[PDB]
Amino acid sequence: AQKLMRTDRLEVCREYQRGNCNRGENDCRFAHPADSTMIDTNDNTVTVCMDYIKGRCSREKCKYFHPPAHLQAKIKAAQYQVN
């Protein structure tokens, strides 16, 4: 995230984090992270990959989260080049 002036986070589903939720893929109000290690316990959020949000990131061993189309639109609009 050092490529811009600030970090970027996404709110994690309180049902997914506590047990399960199957809607994050296209309908839930929050994000569903595959890599549970990316979730910050201090705020219930995941750091978002500024390469996928602006161009492309697809490496299965990434350091950040890649949101589904529904959530991703908010972060595509959240980027330094737009906001």
Q: Which of 36-41's residues contact partners 24+ apart within 8 Å by CB, and which partners? A: 38/64, 38/65, 39/12, 40/9
Letters for 6-45 (x = contact with Zn ion by CB under 5 A, - = none) are -------x--x----x-xx---x-----------------
Q: Is 50 in the site for Zn ion (CB under 5 A)?
A: no
Nearer to Zn ion, 28 or 78 (CB): 28
23 φ, ψ (degrees, to nearest 5): -105, -20
Nearer to Zn ion, 10 or 49 (CB): 49
Residue of 17, 44, 57, 79 that binds Zn ion (CB under 5 A): 57
Nearer to Zn ion, 23 or 54 (CB): 23
Please tell me the distance from the alpha carbon of residue 56 to that of residue 67, in angstroms, as a whole number.
Answer: 12
Beta bridge partners of 47: 9
